[PDB]
Amino acid sequence: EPIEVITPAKITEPEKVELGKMLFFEPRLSKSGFISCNSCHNLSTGGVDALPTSIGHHWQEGPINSPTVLNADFMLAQFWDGRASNLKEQAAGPIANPKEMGFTHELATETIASMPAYRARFAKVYGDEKVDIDRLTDAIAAFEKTLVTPNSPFDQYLLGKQDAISGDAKAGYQLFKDKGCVSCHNGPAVGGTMFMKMGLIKPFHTNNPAEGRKGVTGKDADKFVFKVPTLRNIELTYPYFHDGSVWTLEEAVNTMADIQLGQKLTEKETKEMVAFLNSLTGEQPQISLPILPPSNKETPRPVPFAT
Amino acid sequence: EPIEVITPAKITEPEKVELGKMLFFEPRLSKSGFISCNSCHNLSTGGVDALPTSIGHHWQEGPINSPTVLNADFMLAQFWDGRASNLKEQAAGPIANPKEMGFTHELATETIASMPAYRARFAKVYGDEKVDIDRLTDAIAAFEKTLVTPNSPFDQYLLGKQDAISGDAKAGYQLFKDKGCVSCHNGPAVGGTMFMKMGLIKPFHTNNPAEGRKGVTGKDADKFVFKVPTLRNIELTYPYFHDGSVWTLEEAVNTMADIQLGQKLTEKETKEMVAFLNSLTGEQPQISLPILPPSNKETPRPVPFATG
Numbered sequence: 001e002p003i004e005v006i007t008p009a010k011i012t013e014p015e016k017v018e019l020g021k022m023l024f025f026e027p028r029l030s031k032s033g034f035i036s037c038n039s040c041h042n043l044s045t046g047g048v049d050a051l052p053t054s055i056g057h058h059w060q061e062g063p064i065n066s067p068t069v070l071n072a073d074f075m076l077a078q079f080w081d082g083r084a085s086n087l088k089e090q091a092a093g094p095i096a097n098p099k100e101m102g103f104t105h106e107l108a109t110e111t112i113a114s115m116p117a118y119r120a121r122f123a124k125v126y127g128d129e130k131v132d133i134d135r136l137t138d139a140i141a142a143f144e145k146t147l148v149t150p151n152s153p154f155d156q157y158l159l160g161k162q163d164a165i166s167g168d169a170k171a172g173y174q175l176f177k178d179k180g181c182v183s184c185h186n187g188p189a190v191g192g193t194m195f196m197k198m199g200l201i202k203p204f205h206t207n208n209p210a211e212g213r214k215g216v217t218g219k220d221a222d223k224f225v226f227k228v229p230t231l232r233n234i235e236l237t238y239p240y241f242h243d244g245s246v247w248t249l250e251e252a253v254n255t256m257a258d259i260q261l262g263q264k265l266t267e268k269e270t271k272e273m274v275a276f277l278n279s280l281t282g283e284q285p286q287i288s289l290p291i292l293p294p295s296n297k298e299t300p301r302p303v304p305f306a307t
Numbered sequence: 308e309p310i311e312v313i314t315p316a317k318i319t320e321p322e323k324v325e326l327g328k329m330l331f332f333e334p335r336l337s338k339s340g341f342i343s344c345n346s347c348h349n350l351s352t353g354g355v356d357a358l359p360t361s362i363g364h365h366w367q368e369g370p371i372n373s374p375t376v377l378n379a380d381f382m383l384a385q386f387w388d389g390r391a392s393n394l395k396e397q398a399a400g401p402i403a404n405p406k407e408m409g410f411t412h413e414l415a416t417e418t419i420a421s422m423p424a425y426r427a428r429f430a431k432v433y434g435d436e437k438v439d440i441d442r443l444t445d446a447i448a449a450f451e452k453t454l455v456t457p458n459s460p461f462d463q464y465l466l467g468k469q470d471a472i473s474g475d476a477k478a479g480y481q482l483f484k485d486k487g488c489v490s491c492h493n494g495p496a497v498g499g500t501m502f503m504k505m506g507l508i509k510p511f512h513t514n515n516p517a518e519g520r521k522g523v524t525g526k527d528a529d530k531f532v533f534k535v536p537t538l539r540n541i542e543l544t545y546p547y548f549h550d551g552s553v554w555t556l557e558e559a560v561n562t563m564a565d566i567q568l569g570q571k572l573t574e575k576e577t578k579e580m581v582a583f584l585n586s587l588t589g590e591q592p593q594i595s596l597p598i599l600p601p602s603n604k605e606t607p608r609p610v611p612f613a614t615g
């Protein structure tokens with residue numbers, strides 16, 4: 001089969017994953033002292049804010065839909081345009097992004113380094129108490145690699161449990177293959193293995209200006225070519241597409257069939273397609289909320305409002 | 308001894324607690340779909356946002372410092388001005404407060420009732436799958452009552468363990484008593500047993516307009532009379548006072564000694580006091596980040612920007 005099962009994450013650097021988990025939930029990575037990775041990739045809600053575009057520092061309206069951190073390591077690159085190569089490189093972006101955490105790499109590292117409890121952990125992981133952006137993002141990336149979603153009802157079906165999904169869902173997987181969805185959405189993450197044009201046969205209408213891969217490569221052929229997203233946990237990651245325009249998976253599957261394949265789905269076919277896509281929802285990360293250390297007199301004060 | 312030990316939470320109703328935890332972390336209880344109770348009472352950082360005052364809907368600056376939910380069921384009343392009797396009544400407020408979650412009770416219950424997984428849990432706890440603010444806030448309060456902080460160094464000391472706290476911290480505690488702090492800050496939560504004047508001997512110098520109890524009662528005698536906060540986990544719940552004006556416990560202790568007692572602390576005395584107070588940090592809630600059900604076609608969409 002073109003779709004493969006996701007296996008539970010193997011943790012090989014436990015101290016580092018713990019430090020990463022703390023940092024993913026650390027709102028003092030932001031200027032406000034209020035926004036953490038979790039604010040926009042909420043692990044209680046499919047690893048996303050579930051908004052059309054993000055709400056950032058000062059309630060600024062973000063330019064693009066927040067994708068899920070779930071199974072993000074199976075992606076060939078990171079961000080919609082693939083401008084980051086892995087999760088460690090990606091993590092540098094939000095901290096310093098004015099529309100997101102609104103901080104700087106220098107302020108983030110000073111903030112974390114103010115606290116002996118954090119310094120002790122960087123020392124255990126990397127060899128001394130220095131905090132720099134490489135270590136901080138490396139730790140975050142190590143944690144994110146644990147956020148896989150094994151044991152979806154579909155995975156149980158691929159492993160031979162014929163009763164793990166409905167007949168609607170089984171017919172939907174067949175449609176998925178037979179219509180050509182799988183040509184772009186395949187591998188363990190049902191997506192994430194390639195860049196492809198959004199609007200291959202028919203243009204995709206949006207008033208969102210994001211040009212995708214063209215903004216990394218400079219190639220006009222790369223205009224509106226985006227990373228193919230994962231369809232794992234697609235049930236949870238509404239609204240859909242990079243512009244957050246579509247709230248129902250019903251409409252997303254029909255928009256994809258219409259513009260990627262040249263023909264929308266029937267009522268029955270949509271029912272089946274959605275059934276299959278929901279069966280891709282895996283076991284969500286079970287994480288204990290991390291207990292973060294107190295700020296001290298050396299910790300930069302947050303600036304939620306004026307100064 | 309005027310301070311008592313915090314015992315671990317007796318969990319008698321774990322299904323309700325579970326439901327309560329989900330709702331406490333549920334950002335779809337806010338109009339924006341972005342703010343939950345945990346936003347302002349962040350359980351990773353002492354049950355508080357650690358901001359001078361809170362960030363609400365549309366990034367509004369709130370009027371007062373968000374208190375910790377840790378040990379809050381020990382409080383004689385809820386809110387700085389004591390306007391809510393207990394955690395259940397309290398929880399109704401923020402959901403409908405325009406400067407906080409900015410939602411309505413009607414929309415909150417419709418939002419939760421839209422999802423079969425939520426309806427199933429309400430049924431399992433209350434007997435049918437109807438959602439109203441009564442059951443919603445009952446479940447949240449059930450979860451909050453579990454958020455006690457046992458096993459602090461000072462508790463170990465009260466129980467007899469002499470090396471539980473430092474020499475400084477021991478001197479700290481005798482000073483806390485001898486100077487009269489314990490007249491207002493006592494019991495299991497080292498606080499929350501009474502409302503007292505902020506600025507008993509001298510005025511509290513603040514630019515914050517909050518009136519305290521007078522705002523609720525109208526009485527001139529209740530002016531700047533506030534619920535005495537818990538000092539449990541005071542290490543973690545900076546900045547201090549209802550105006551969130553002071554970031555160090557050093558300043559906080561000196562301000563109190565001065566304006567509540569007419570007393571000035573030696574540097575060694577302030578350091579002793581701060582060591583004592585630091586010893587009041589207990590074991591933090593150990594909880595699993597709740598997995599919330601997906602919205603569906605009957606779930607009201609979040610409204611992060613629109614005025615309607």
Ligand code: HEM
Pocket residue numbers: 024035036037038039040041054055056057062064065066067068069072075077078079080081087090091094095099100101140227
């Ligand atoms: C260090 C903290 C953060 C981490 C580790 C993180 C993680 C990630 C990852 C892995 C991706 C790419 C996944 C993919 O392309 O499929 C991503 C993209 C994105 N995240 Fe975050 N995130 C963080 C902070 C934030 C915050 C605070 C916000 C909102 C204010 C946010 C909103 C977004 C948006 C809008 C994108 C897509 C941007 C683009 O494609 O250019 N992220 N994040």
Ligand code: HEM
Pocket residue numbers: 176179180181182183184185195196197198200225226227228229230231234237239240241242243252253256257260261273
């Ligand atoms: C009917 C068959 C298909 C179905 C049901 C389907 C399903 C989906 C869904 C549900 C999304 C939204 C993901 C998200 O927002 O996180 C999506 C996005 C996407 N898919 Fe498909 N897909 C199909 C066919 C294809 C084909 C044939 C291609 C390539 C030719 C493709 C490439 C993409 C791309 C580039 C995106 C991101 C588009 C954007 O938001 O700009 N898909 N797909």
Ligand code: HEM
Pocket residue numbers: 331342343344346347348361362363364369370371372373374375376379382384385386387388394397398399401402406407408447534
């Ligand atoms: C239903 C969700 C919430 C719950 C269960 C909750 C819990 C509590 C509790 C127990 C108190 C009183 C504790 C005490 O006075 O000792 C309180 C007060 C307070 N909380 Fe929340 N909270 C919620 C939502 C929020 C949000 C979203 C914000 C920020 C936007 C916030 C900020 C505050 C503030 C500023 C106060 C003090 C207000 C006053 O004294 O008048 N709360 N909360």
Ligand code: HEM
Pocket residue numbers: 483486487488489490491492502503504505507533534535536537538541544546547548549550556559560563564567568580
């Ligand atoms: C040196 C002795 C004292 C110390 C070290 C002390 C400690 C503290 C601390 C650290 C706070 C900040 C709590 C927070 O912001 O959450 C506080 C607040 C408070 N304490 Fe004390 N306290 C002392 C004496 C007193 C006395 C004698 C009274 C009553 C007469 C009192 C009543 C209060 C009240 C009403 C508040 C809240 C005031 C406000 O922010 O509006 N304290 N105390």
Ligand SMILES: [Ca+2]
Pocket residue numbers: 048065066067237238239240241
């Ligand atoms: Ca989405």
Ligand SMILES: [Ca+2]
Pocket residue numbers: 355372373374544545546547548551
């Ligand atoms: Ca405080």
